[PDB]
Amino acid sequence: LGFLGAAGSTMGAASMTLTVQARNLLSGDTHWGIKQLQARVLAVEHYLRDQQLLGIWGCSGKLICCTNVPWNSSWSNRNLSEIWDNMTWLQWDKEISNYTQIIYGLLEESQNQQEKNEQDLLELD
Amino acid sequence: NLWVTVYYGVPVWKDAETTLFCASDAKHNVWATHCCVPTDPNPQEIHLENVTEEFNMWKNNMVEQMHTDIISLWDQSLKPCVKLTPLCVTLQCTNVTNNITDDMRGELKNCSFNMTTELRDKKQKVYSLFYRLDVVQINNKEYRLINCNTSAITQACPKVSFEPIPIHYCAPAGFAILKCKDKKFNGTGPCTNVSTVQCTHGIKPVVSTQLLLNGSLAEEEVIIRSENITNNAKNILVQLNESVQINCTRPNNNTVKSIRIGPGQWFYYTGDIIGDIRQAHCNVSKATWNETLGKVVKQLRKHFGNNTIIRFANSSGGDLEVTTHSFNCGGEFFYCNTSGLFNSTWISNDSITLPCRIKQIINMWQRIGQAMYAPPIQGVIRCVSNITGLILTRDGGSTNSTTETFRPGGGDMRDNWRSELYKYKVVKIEPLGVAPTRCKRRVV
Amino acid sequence: NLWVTVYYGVPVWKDAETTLFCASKHNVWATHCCVPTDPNPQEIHLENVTEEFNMWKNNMVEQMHTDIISLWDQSLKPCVKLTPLCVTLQCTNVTNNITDDMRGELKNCSFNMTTELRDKKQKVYSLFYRLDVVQINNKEYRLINCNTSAITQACPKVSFEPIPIHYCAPAGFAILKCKDKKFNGTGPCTNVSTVQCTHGIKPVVSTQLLLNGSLAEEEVIIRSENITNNAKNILVQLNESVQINCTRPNNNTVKSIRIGPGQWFYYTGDIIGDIRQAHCNVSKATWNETLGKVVKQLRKHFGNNTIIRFANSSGGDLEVTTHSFNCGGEFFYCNTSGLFNSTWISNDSITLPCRIKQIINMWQRIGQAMYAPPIQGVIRCVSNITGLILTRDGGSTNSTTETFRPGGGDMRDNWRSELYKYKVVKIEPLGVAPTRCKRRV
Amino acid sequence: SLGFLGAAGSTMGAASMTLTVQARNLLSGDTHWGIKQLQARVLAVEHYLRDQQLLGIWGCSGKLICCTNVPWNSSWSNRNLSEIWDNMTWLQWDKEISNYTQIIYGLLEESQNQQEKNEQDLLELD
Amino acid sequence: LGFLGAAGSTMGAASMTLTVQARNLLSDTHWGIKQLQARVLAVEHYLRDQQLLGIWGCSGKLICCTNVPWNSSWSNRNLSEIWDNMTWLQWDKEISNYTQIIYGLLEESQNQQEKNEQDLL
Amino acid sequence: NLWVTVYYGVPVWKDAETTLFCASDAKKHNVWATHCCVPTDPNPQEIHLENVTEEFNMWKNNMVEQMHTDIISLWDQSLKPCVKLTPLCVTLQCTNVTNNITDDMRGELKNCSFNMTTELRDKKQKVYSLFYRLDVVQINNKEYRLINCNTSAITQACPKVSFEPIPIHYCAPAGFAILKCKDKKFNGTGPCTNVSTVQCTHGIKPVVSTQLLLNGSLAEEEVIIRSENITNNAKNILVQLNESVQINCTRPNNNTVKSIRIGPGQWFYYTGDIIGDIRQAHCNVSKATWNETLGKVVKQLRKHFGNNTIIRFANSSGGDLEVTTHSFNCGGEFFYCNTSGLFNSTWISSNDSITLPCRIKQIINMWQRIGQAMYAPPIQGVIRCVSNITGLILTRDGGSTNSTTETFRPGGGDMRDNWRSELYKYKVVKIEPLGVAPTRCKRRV
Ligand SMILES: *[C@@H]1O[C@H](CO)[C@@H](O[C@@H]2O[C@H](CO)[C@@H](O[C@@H]3O[C@H](CO[C@H]4O[C@H](CO)[C@@H](O)[C@H](O)[C@@H]4O)[C@@H](O)[C@H](O[C@H]4O[C@H](CO)[C@@H](O)[C@H](O)[C@@H]4O)[C@@H]3O)[C@H](O)[C@H]2NC(C)=O)[C@H](O)[C@H]1NC(C)=O
Ligand SMILES: *[C@@H]1O[C@H](CO)[C@@H](O[C@@H]2O[C@H](CO)[C@@H](O[C@@H]3O[C@H](CO[C@H]4O[C@H](CO)[C@@H](O)[C@H](O)[C@@H]4O)[C@@H](O)[C@H](O[C@H]4O[C@H](CO)[C@@H](O)[C@H](O)[C@@H]4O)[C@@H]3O)[C@H](O)[C@H]2NC(C)=O)[C@H](O)[C@H]1NC(C)=O
Ligand SMILES: *[C@@H]1O[C@H](CO)[C@@H](O[C@@H]2O[C@H](CO)[C@@H](O)[C@H](O)[C@H]2NC(C)=O)[C@H](O)[C@H]1NC(C)=O
Ligand SMILES: *[C@@H]1O[C@H](CO)[C@@H](O)[C@H](O)[C@H]1NC(C)=O
Ligand SMILES: *[C@@H]1O[C@H](CO)[C@@H](O)[C@H](O)[C@H]1NC(C)=O
Ligand SMILES: *[C@@H]1O[C@H](CO)[C@@H](O)[C@H](O)[C@H]1NC(C)=O
Ligand SMILES: *[C@@H]1O[C@H](CO)[C@@H](O)[C@H](O)[C@H]1NC(C)=O
Ligand SMILES: *[C@@H]1O[C@H](CO)[C@@H](O)[C@H](O)[C@H]1NC(C)=O
Ligand SMILES: *[C@@H]1O[C@H](CO)[C@@H](O)[C@H](O)[C@H]1NC(C)=O
Ligand SMILES: *[C@@H]1O[C@H](CO)[C@@H](O)[C@H](O)[C@H]1NC(C)=O
Ligand SMILES: *[C@@H]1O[C@H](CO)[C@@H](O)[C@H](O)[C@H]1NC(C)=O
Ligand SMILES: *[C@@H]1O[C@H](CO)[C@@H](O)[C@H](O)[C@H]1NC(C)=O
Ligand SMILES: *[C@@H]1O[C@H](CO)[C@@H](O)[C@H](O)[C@H]1NC(C)=O
Ligand SMILES: *[C@@H]1O[C@H](CO)[C@@H](O)[C@H](O)[C@H]1NC(C)=O
Ligand SMILES: *[C@@H]1O[C@H](CO)[C@@H](O)[C@H](O)[C@H]1NC(C)=O
Ligand SMILES: *[C@@H]1O[C@H](CO)[C@@H](O)[C@H](O)[C@H]1NC(C)=O
Ligand SMILES: *[C@@H]1O[C@H](CO)[C@@H](O)[C@H](O)[C@H]1NC(C)=O
Helix, strand or coil: CCHHHEEEHHHHHHHHHHHHHHHCCCCCCCHHHHHHHHHHHHHHHHHHHHHHHHHHHHCCCCEEEEEEEECCCCCCCCCCCHCCCCCEHHHHHHHHCCHHHHHHHHHHHHHHHHHHHHHHCCCCC | CCEEEEECCCCCCCEEECCCEEECCCCCEEEHHEEEECCCCCCEEEEECCCCCCCCCHHHHHHHHHHHHHHHHHHHCCCCCCCCCCCCEEEEECCCCCCCCCHHHCCEEEEEEEEEECCCCCCEHHHHHEHHHHEECCEEEEEEHHHHHHCEEEEEECCCCCCCEEEECCCCEEEEEEEECCCCCCCCCCCCCCEEECCCECCCCCEEEEEEEEECCCCCEEEECCCCCCCCCCEEEEEEEEEEEEEEEEEEECCCCECCCCCCCCCEEEEEECCCCCEEEEEHHHHHHHHHHHHHHHHHHHCCCCCEEECCCCCCCCHHHHHHHHEECCEEEEEEECCCCCCEEEECCCEEEEEECCCEEEEEHHCCEEEEEECCCEEEEEEEEEEEEEEEEEEECCCCCCCECECCCCCCHHHHHHCCCEEEEEEEEECCEEEEEECCCCCC | EEEEEEEEECCCEEEECCCCCCCCCCCCCHCCCEEEEEEECCCEEECCEEEEEEHHHHHHHHHHHHHHHHHHHHCCCCCCCCCHHHHCEEECCCCCCCCCCCCCCEEEEEEECCCCCCCEEEEEEEEEEEEHHHECEEEEECCCCCCCCCECCCCCCCCEEEEEEEEECCCCEEEEEECCCCCCCCCEEECCEEEEEECCEECCCCCCCEEEECCCCCCCCEEEECCCCCCCCEEEEEEEEEEEEEEEEEEEECCEEEECCEEEEEEECEEEEECCEEEEEHHHHHHHHHHHHHHHHHHHHHHCCCCEEEEECEEEEEEEEEEEEEEECCCCCCCCCHHHCCEEECCCCHHHHHECEEEHHHHHCCEEEEEEECCCCCEEEEEEEEEEEEECCCCCCCCEEEEEEEEECHHHHHHHHHHHHHEEEEEEEEEEECCCCCCCC | CCCCCHHHCCCCCCHHHHHHHCCCCCCCCHHHHHHHHHHHHHHHHHHHHHCCCCHHHHHCCCCCCCEEEEHHHCCCCCCCCCHHHCCCCCCHHHHHCCHHHHHHHHHHHHHHHHHHHHHHHHHHHH | CCCCCCCEECCCCHHHHHHHHHHHHCCHHHHHHHHHHHHHHHHHHHHHHHHHHHHHHHCCCCCCEEEECCCCCCCCHHHHHHCCCCCCCHHHHHCCHHHHHHHHHHHHHHHHHHHHHHCCC | CEEEEEECCCCCCCECCCCCCEEEECCCCHHHHHHHCCCCCCCHHHHHHHHCCEEEECCCCCHHHHHHHHHHHHHHHHHCCCCCCHCCCEEEEEEEEEECCCCCCCCEEEEEEEEEECCCCCCCCEEEEEEEEEHHEECCCCCCEEECCCCCCCCEEECCCCCCCCCEEECCCCEEEEEEEEECCCCCCCCCCEEEECCCCCEEECCCCCCCEECCCCCCCEEEEECCCCCCCCCCCCEEEEEEEEEEEEEECCCEEEEEEEECEEEEECCCCEECCCCCCCEECHHHHHHHHHHHHHHHHHHHHCCCCEEEEECCCCCCCHHHHHHEEEECEEEEEECHHCCCCCCCCCHHHHHHEEEECCCEEEHHHCEEEEECCCCCCCCCEEEEEEEEEEEEEECCCCCCEEEEEEEECCCCHHHHHHHHCCEEEEEEEEEEECCCCCCCC
């Protein structure tokens, strides 16, 4: 399908559309010219912020990444079978509201530790 | 077995506000000049399977942008044009008396004044006819133009066409336009048939005050949409599922003359008139009108009770711009009397002829401080247009008589675009998210 | 033995220039600085950091100058022009209810102005101050700027009252603060911290003496780019404020006319009651103690065996020789010679007369004249002196007696006071260092 | 954690654990005024991208800390390693050298070129 | 040697300058806008190239080997001609507008590889 | 047994339009320099490309189009803050200047008077001045108005602003490169084998003139004649000379310039009087040089027309002064010089400098646009300028009956042609870093 045809997709099914969603993110009177110029700049800023975060978390090389952060019961209490193919991703997303900063902080810290540990030992005399 | 996985490129979005740009493709038309992007929307439609969305037309920021953008284009288009400041002089006038019917007695005045010309040193005496609506007595009598005590007036440039053409609004990267596909949607429902486009439908900016012209029709039934049905002080936007054809003319054959005032600045004169003097008129089929209103009433009573009697009275007192049906017909500005359309009470072929007046000074968008002068148009004017909807208000002040009254409404023009784009929403794309996987990062 | 290793995100910076944005109802400042500031200062004190500051080279001063000029020019852009009024005036003196501290100061003028219709003229009467009117030669007069510049009426609905202004760094930049007690404006500073934005600095415009600014804290602090060089101004920051109560005592009437379609002109009309000169009241006791404190601090720069005298101002135009400020929206010019008479050898207030002027050539710029519409009623304000601009009279022959004269200068020096503590730097995330490891291959 | 540049007083070694905060604060989050603001945003982006491009070129993309295959030259600096990492901050370090920037970058560019061409030959062989 | 210097060199030889080119791709209201528009476009083109290398799994390498088989239909020219005699300009003329075909194929190979790894982890 | 190999930083490009930025050197109030505040590099680069071929087409070149667009804009922006002369167009009363003038230049000037508004709105002042007849049109007793009064507002150019052309370098934005053809003898309408890449163009002065190309690039080997279509007689022929010819032009009379205030800081300048001799403006070009130069051009034309042809020169078609004469700016004044003295002879199968008269006018419809006008303040003192002719613009009459005799005449057209000549050797391309090729490697899985 095309962009967003995955809207009704389950979390499992949705994994096969990560490339259509990703490829469509980039690009397609004084006051008019400025407004459109501003819009283009903002699109770039949003793009870069997302890339920076994936970089920081160590998942910049993939559309799908396993992290070194455990899942918390304070975030959700559902089964793997409940979530995959028995859940539509759009709803899964509303269900994780307010957990964004918690999760990001954890991703940053676990990545900080992994890089540090590798520097101390794999690079060791 | 409890871990975190992260994804990029997930099909997720949030309600969002961004700036849209226009595009249109089909001479010196302002809309055509401005909306320079080619469109050609061949791949636009993507259906979203298993999607329900919340829409709310009354909070549509796109309406606000159209209002803003339309005014901006209008003003910009009039900047490189002739200023008529030099015409704020004492004007001497007498009555036009020749070949005038009763309906037009005193309507036109024969005026003259001392105008400047190319050299500062030279003056010229000129003559013109005016509609009484544009001229005020000073107090053989002396007059001034109505705008001179408030602001300078600018003459619109004759080559420039403001004729509305379909305009498509296109999203910037990172955004999408989401559309409701529900024939019974009243503007705020949780639509269960949703699709998206990158650029929307070509909707033309037709501007009017009592009834709505050249819009879309409802697919199956008349739909009555209001932000608060209960609130009497709201415009009710009624969309018809059938159009009503209306024919409207300006029967007098106008001679247009022009005089140079400045180095390249020219002013257009009304000249004189060929043919007996008559007022302007619009014609609506009586039977069609009666069927149309009855259809509205049935739906209206579904909201207000099917044992209710509904009176459709004419407009309330107020300024011409408020009480009449105002529209642009062939470049001319008409102010028509709609009382002839609202004289029935609903309980359990000839046309309707509506007299109309013409005014050349327009305080468009009700923004006081500026005025535009509409040059006279050579010959006669005829246009045909479709009534695709209307605006009503409740009169209120009920006595629990179960007899509601709905006079015609009015207001700014935001409601006009809200009606046409009631089905569209804008969202932002959000590519990142996580899930409760059982996979841990595999590390040394 | 050692290898090159590189890092990203290294906490270092370089001196740099950039554009700071402004952040905080018909007030020009409020309108422009529509962006709110965060409620949280977010200041990080740095440990083990010394930084070098130089207030005389702080480019933030230049930015503020540019920004203020822009706002004034923008603000007057949509206002009615008064060029239709550059006509010959017929004037006589106002002689009734005169105390003679203003004899001939105000004149009664009349003129034929254009009304909204071009073919109708009207006789109008008004009262003008001598400062705005010159003789052409019941004599023929003209406004002072009708031979040099266009005159624009400031819009009656727009306030220019200064509000605190905060400047904020763009991403990639940071602002460092000095905050070193008794710092003289230059060199290494050890009380350094990092901030996102400056505090709110109110852009009060004045000459000779600075009003409603920051204090010197514990001691009076005197700063100059060069102590010896008499070409430099001396910025004296007081450690306590001095209040001054200033008024325009006459009860005025405001009248207006249409000079065009939607074009209204405002004028002084009539005066209710009798005539009194504008004036400012300064406590002498406070003032005399204040000056002594200033001298005690000046002594560390010139020697404690030197005798000091304070002189009145030098010659120049009104904007140069008198103290100037905006009070109630009116423009006051005050004679401060009475404040600088004494010598220091090793309620009892003073009243300073003031003058009122309506046509203002702002910022020492010529070609853009602003007309100040009249204010009805009586004007009163109380302002705080927080510092002075002084110069050393110069001409010294090493006589051991020195004289300091009130100075003044470009508005940049006033902003230089509150911008004293701030510096902006660019962040440089990359760096290289030696280590033990070689890249794994 | 002190936050952005709170590491200014930290030793070079200690400061390595704050590289992430410094990275986070590099991205953001009247006709003339509008232009000035656009210029500011564009330049910030250009600087960000230039640093990322170079990390790519030098083969350290995705890392905050990267070992290279370029040996250290004592002509740039000849100091005790323990003094560098434990008794100096990064700001002091930068000031200590404030040189040889182009030399180092040239060495990094080439050592990456050597590594990628060697990988290409080996992979075509197997 | 220099920016786009060895333009006439063969495709194989040309590998020696690919880095110089990469390093040189990054840096009155009407005038100011023209310049901003130019800067923005340069950024957009740059990011699109990076995005493509990302989606194909080549973002970490200047020179990338992929698993997409070569189609003799696109070109039946020999490696002995392509790397040793032809230049990149000539080659591009002979790519005969099949670039987008290859892009679609590269994208599919990458999708398969990322999914397979995730199932294996 | 092949797969796809992906490369980044690939040395390929495409023809592409983009704008260039303007740069200038370190050498006031010069309009060009004021706009082009970006300095050029002290050390320019050029890389010759070995085993390179390219194609140039000067007739389809957006570099020229940009230069035109920007030069117009700059001109107009420069006049934005200058005093408008709107109040100046009042009934003008004139008599002819005949008492001090020789029969030559007699009748060129009129002595006119008018009542103009001064600093105060209540007053007018009586002003009289000298005018060229070309700026004044009769109304009908003697009664005149300014010639462009009934077309547009006239703005006085600001007297401090210099328009003297300075070399301008156009520089590529990142992602783009400028290619140039170094072939010693080519017409730039096709393939080139000596090609190099540069960051910026050679500086080109923004000289404005018609039917004659002044202070440009000189050909090095021979006269080179180029056109878009040789057989199309409706097109201009650009002739690039390989030897320059010096032309000495003057405005010989010593005037007096006066000025008045017409408003609050508004100054108007006009010619007050003339002291001494009154003579027509003129230009002097060596005859011998001209005949040899023209002969070289003819030899070059013969290469395209035949061994037995007859090459006739004649003057241009009649029409507006602006298209008919060799217009140019000399010392800041606008000259409209005769052409016929140089185009009379037919070529068959001290130095007697030719003197041509020049007209001068102060109201100019700049850039051949209608609806705008500028007034040239009078310039105080005697004016002399000496310049180099580096090229010519001619048309062929066509309508051939194969008589073998053909006529060439001076002619003009859009001023872009002047810049096409200077830019005939440059092209702009977009750099395209990605590409693919077949390989013997596959990824490890
Ligand atoms: C609802 O929708 C309808 C249908 O589109 C609109 O009706 C149209 O209104 C426009 C504007 O008045 C009409 O266009 C004008 O037609 C004039 C007459 O043209 C005749 O001859 C041509 C052939 O040459 C026929 O195609 C045409 O049907 C007529 O028989 C022209 O003279 C007008 O020209 C104007 O502009 C030119 C420059 O472009 C000037 O030189 C002219 O002097 C003049 O100013 C113009 O083209 C159009 O014909 C109507 N369509 C139909 C089917 O009748 C309604 O107006 C719209 N309602 C609302 C409220 O918007
Ligand atoms: C092709 O190229 C030639 C270059 O030689 C051009 O001819 C030159 O034109 C310029 C512009 O008018 C001349 O420069 C002017 O010269 C005037 C004469 O003064 C002479 O003596 C002084 C003594 O120091 C010299 O510096 C000066 O160069 C002259 O030799 C000056 O009075 C002018 O200054 C005034 O005008 C300028 C305008 O920019 C102002 O900036 C100044 O403040 C001042 O008001 C000016 O310097 C130059 O002299 C000419 N060269 C020759 C032959 O002498 C041709 O014009 C050009 N072709 C075309 C198409 O024009
Ligand atoms: C342009 O073509 C010439 C050949 O005409 C190239 O010369 C080669 O030089 C290398 C050494 O650097 C030799 O090993 C080759 O054998 C030469 N080629 C031939 C056919 O003899 C020259 O390198 C080419 N220039 C560029 C930039 O590629
Ligand atoms: C919507 O639901 C149907 C089952 O009724 C399913 O086959 C289809 O794939 C779903 N749509 C999407 C985008 O997954
Ligand atoms: C989950 O979050 C709570 C806070 O609500 C915290 O106390 C707990 O330690 C967290 N557990 C894990 C496994 O992260
Ligand atoms: C986030 O917190 C709010 C608090 O009111 C809650 O309503 C909402 O459901 C939460 N979102 C989640 C847990 O997805
Ligand atoms: C608006 O809607 C509410 C709920 O239906 C109703 O109570 C209210 O009366 C409405 N507005 C007014 C002013 O009637
Ligand atoms: C409605 O009709 C009445 C009947 O005379 C009239 O007075 C009134 O003005 C009409 N509408 C308006 C504008 O009030
Ligand atoms: C008016 O006032 C001036 C003060 O400048 C004085 O010189 C003059 O004599 C006065 N004239 C009259 C009428 O007394
Ligand atoms: C107004 O104009 C008349 C013209 O007769 C003149 O006498 C009178 O003095 C003028 N009045 C003023 C105040 O200038
Ligand atoms: C200030 O400048 C003068 C010269 O103008 C010099 O003699 C003196 O030493 C300078 N003093 C300082 C504080 O640098
Ligand atoms: C002078 O002052 C008295 C007292 O307020 C007042 O009654 C009188 O009218 C004033 N005279 C004039 C000319 O204003
Ligand atoms: C960098 O090298 C230059 C070469 O002379 C030197 O002047 C400069 O001081 C060096 N940088 C520092 C500050 O160490
Ligand atoms: C491919 O063609 C070239 C040139 O004709 C030839 O040298 C080569 O042997 C052919 N096949 C291969 C790859 O050997
Ligand atoms: C010019 O004007 C004078 C008036 O003195 C007249 O004698 C002469 O003939 C006129 N010349 C022409 C050709 O207009
Ligand atoms: C233009 O060139 C073509 C050859 O490409 C030629 O056939 C044609 O006749 C030329 N046009 C004219 C008017 O000679
Ligand atoms: C005659 O024509 C030939 C080409 O056929 C040319 O090479 C030769 O130079 C010409 N000779 C003359 C005298 O024009």
